């Protein structure tokens, strides 16, 4: 549905990363929107897995240990 990250800060972050990789690169607005949706979906999935791990550990507050475990299980 509606995006959860503010558009302009994410656009600026993507452009900064691109400038770090390849300078003087223009971004199509649709490409940045697709990147935004991809990042939102990835973070939503990662947080779902992290919440599953945390609830398994008999705790509600997710901790960086949970995120690390979820990433190691998923192969990242």
């Amino acid at each position: 549905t509606e995006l959860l990250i503010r558009k302009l800060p994410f656009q600026r972050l993507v452009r900064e990363i691109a400038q770090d990789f390849k300078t003087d690169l223009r971004f199509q607005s649709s490409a940045v929107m697709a990147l935004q949706e991809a990042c939102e979906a990835y973070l939503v999935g990662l947080f779902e897995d992290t919440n599953l791990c945390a609830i398994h550990a008999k705790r509600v507050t997710i901790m960086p240990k949970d995120i690390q475990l979820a990433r190691r299980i998923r192969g990242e």
Binding site: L4, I5, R6, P9, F10, R12, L13, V14, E16, I17, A18, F21, K22, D24, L25, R26, F27, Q28, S30, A31, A34, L35, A38, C39, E40, Y42, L43, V44, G45, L46, F47, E48, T50, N51, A54, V60, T61, I62, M63, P64, I67, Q68, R71
Partner: protein, 72 residues
């Protein structure tokens, strides 16, 4: 500049609550920003490589779509 902090703390909290999380540790935000930066760097590197292959100067939607396809 250090623009990764532009991913606001309420944005990460909203993303987590979208996934069903009910409580967020204080150290979740920095780890999430690092993970997001790693994923975004990977996808942007793939998109930039695809754009360079196409002899183009503008990263279009196809480059990002193929970058996502190549990674997971």
């Amino acid at each position: 500049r250090d623009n990764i902090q532009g991913i606001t703390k309420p944005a990460i909290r909203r993303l987590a609550r979208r996934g069903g999380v009910k409580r967020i540790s204080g150290l979740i935000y920095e780890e999430t920003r690092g993970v997001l930066k790693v994923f975004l760097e990977n996808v942007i590197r793939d998109a930039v490589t695809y754009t360079e292959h196409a002899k183009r100067k503008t990263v279009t939607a196809m480059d990002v779509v193929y970058a996502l396809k190549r990674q997971g």
